Amino acid sequence: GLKAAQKTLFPLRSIDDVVRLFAAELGREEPDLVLLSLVLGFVEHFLAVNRVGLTYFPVADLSIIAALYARFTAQIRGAVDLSLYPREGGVSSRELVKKVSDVIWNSLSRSYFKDRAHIQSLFSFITGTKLDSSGVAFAVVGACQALGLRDVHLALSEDHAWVVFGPNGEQTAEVTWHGKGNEDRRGQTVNAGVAERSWLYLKGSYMRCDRKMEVAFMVCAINPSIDLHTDSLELLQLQQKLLWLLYDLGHLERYPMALGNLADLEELEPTPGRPDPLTLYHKGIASAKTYYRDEHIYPYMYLADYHCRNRNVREALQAWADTATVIQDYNYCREDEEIYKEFFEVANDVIPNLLKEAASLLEAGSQGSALQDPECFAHLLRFYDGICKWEEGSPTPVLHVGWATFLVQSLGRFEGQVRQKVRIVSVPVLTFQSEKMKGMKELLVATKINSSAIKLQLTAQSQVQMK
């Protein structure tokens, strides 16, 4: 049951009323994840999915929210019998966690598009019987909280979600699917994936949420998009205000991606008196370095993308070099394709487009151009070095000749006289970690880049055409 004290702010008639409810729940011993997710999903439904009849804000009446809450708790209590799963020591069993995951999974519509917008919340679960992948994980944690299982918490990588539980919160369990066409591992640990040093499991440096961080997750999960060309200003404002609430309370300290999301929101619409976007992107990086061994990729991608948007070539290249310095110490494994796609798009689309415009601006007499800065050439080289080093030791390869054309083109955007300034030193100065780039060193300073030799050095190809 919802408690009396949780009910006093209703009806919620505005963004700020929603914020008050979040503040009240975050001041309680354990914020109520089910209440909060149902509220967010209700207002997201009426602000983004169906705005018919909207005049300011979709008033959330207690009768409506309480009935949805009861629909959830009735479903979970009825289908999960706790007597079947005795709890030693205030901690949950693997079988109980699996039962909860099965109850949520089995409730879902048989067939639907799993990557649609607005299927993240408990409101979607109850009203549409649809959840996205991490939405199932969140729903398992919200169900477990409603059942009194204080030890079950959300675990997050940069591309997946599962749960932690058990003695000292030291157990892991898969509770949802990952990607499209992968082998389901529900009920199993994540320890094989940690041991293979995949990006997917972050070498074990993934997020282990407390309840406050699970609130942060649902807030990050708000989706303001009405359509491909339009976002709800109301939802953007709500998300921004709730992220500052969390920030002020300390609950983003261990949440790099939330800090990046808030930076993105501040760039779109700055809040007077608050840190700049740049400051917030750097805080996200600092969070990753402090709490996650500097093993996260996206904090640097958040930063590079900001600099790219602002056509800051130098700082974008720096940030992408830093990204690649993280990825170098991973093995590229079979379910890591989302980060491969991101690196591919940066090397083979984004950087080319940035340097093409920089070349045109140099022709028109730009000063201080990244294309005349040997430190920028070094950043480009460090980016490729980290990708080559990533590939070393990996069960699946990364580079192929489709990368080589863009490498040759990007190298050629810097004149020989600029490229010659970088001194490549062994263990502007640069050290290579990869054997591919070490072998490419002499090719990098010729006036006219040897395209064929670069292709041979970047790829597995070792022969040239017969005839």
Residue numbers in the entry: 2 to 53, 74 to 386, 399 to 460, 549 to 588
What does the literature reporting this entry say, word for word?
pmcMenin, a 67 kDa protein encoded by the MEN1 (Multiple Endocrine Neoplasia 1) gene, is a chromatin adaptor protein that interacts with MLL1 (Mixed Lineage Leukemia 1, also known as KMT2A) to regulate the expression of multiple genes, including HOXA cluster genes. Importantly, recent clinical studies found emerging resistance to Revumenib treatment and patient relapse as a result of somatic mutations in MEN1, leading to point mutations of T349M, M327I/V, and G331R/D. Understanding how these mutations affect menin structure as well as the interaction with MLL1 and current menin inhibitors will be crucial in the development of a new generation of inhibitors maintaining their activity against menin mutants.
We also solved the crystal structures of these menin mutants, showing no structural changes in the MLL1 binding site on menin. We have also calculated the electrostatic potential for the wild-type, G331R, and G331D menin variants and found that in all cases the MBM1 site on menin has a strong negative charge that is minimally perturbed by either of the two G331 mutations. Point mutation G331D reduces the binding of the high-affinity MBM1 motif of MLL1 by 10-fold yet maintains the potent interaction with longer MLL1 fragments and shows a very slow rate of dissociation of MLL1. Surprisingly, we found virtually no activity of MLL1160 with the meninG331D mutant up to 200 nM, suggesting that this complex might be much more difficult to dissociate. Then, we performed competition experiments with the G331D variant and found that incubations of 24 h or longer are needed to observe dissociation of the meninG331D–MLL14-43 complex. These results demonstrate that meninG331D binds MLL1 with a similar affinity as wild-type menin, but this complex undergoes a very slow dissociation and longer residence time, most likely due to the additional negative charge in the binding site introduced by the G331D mutation.
